[PDB]
Design a protein around this ligand. Sequence first.
Ligand SMILES: O=C(N[C@@H](COc1ccc2[nH]c(=O)[nH]c2c1)c1ccccc1)c1cccn(Cc2ccc(F)c(F)c2)c1=O
Length: 278
Amino acid sequence: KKRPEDFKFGKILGEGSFSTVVLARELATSREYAIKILEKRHIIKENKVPYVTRERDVMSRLDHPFFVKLYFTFQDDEKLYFGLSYAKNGELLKYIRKIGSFDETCTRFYTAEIVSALEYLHGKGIIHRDLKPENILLNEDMHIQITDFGTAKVLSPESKQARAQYVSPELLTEKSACKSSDLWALGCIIYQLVAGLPPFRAGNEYLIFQKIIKLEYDFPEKFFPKARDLVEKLLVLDATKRLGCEEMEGYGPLKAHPFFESVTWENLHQQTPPKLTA
Ligand SMILES: O=C(N[C@@H](COc1ccc2[nH]c(=O)[nH]c2c1)c1ccccc1)c1cccn(Cc2ccc(F)c(F)c2)c1=O
């Protein structure tokens, strides 16, 4: 078992739900991990601290190339520690501030990795509920690493549902989430990769929420036609009519959409990602 003294702790990578993720270097190996630290003082019923109880065991057991993984755990008198994948290259959409919108080859590749990751997650009955560019990190090899900050939920077999710019209308109109809520988020992400901006934009959050529920958005003139078609098929108010959803025959029709022509879905993790720039 590892212990706190085996690492040199660096900067904070992220924080939420009484959990702080810190960059750490393993002294013996020079390997870097993102170690999540929870103070035992905060583990009380009223706080609903994630990853302490059994309801997230299926998430903790994931061993997929596109999700940050749990490698080890340990504890001391005051804290719980969870060693997670470190995604060296940070947030995927961070390149937009320099480079602007992604080209079709790069959009197709990164969209395929996200779709492949969501298919796997949904196949385990897990819904993310807060999928956004901030949660799509990139490792040293430039492959995606999707993070959860305690929003993901395992659905029960008895229900296909569970209780701003990337939020689906059902999370706004009926305060519920389903697998299809994540496909709405995917539609927003694809649009942002291509356009360089998210689809629902307005003067403030209140107005953005109105645009979402009314489907008030437009495409710029330069939007790749196959990507436009795909986005229109994901950004549908009725959650049962989104491409990829259970009621629309699942992932096959989504992975077979013309936007994904030439994609080799089985080896995306082994392919060299296309460079965003030389
Ligand atoms: O513990 C897990 N995730 C952490 C966040 O992990 C981070 C955050 C930033 C980082 N930067 C970097 O380089 N590595 C980083 C790791 C968490 C924080 C706060 C509350 C709850 C969880 C965590 C534990 C186990 C598995 N996963 C992957 C996962 C689970 C369910 C999903 F639906 C999903 F899409 C992905 C986790 O995110």
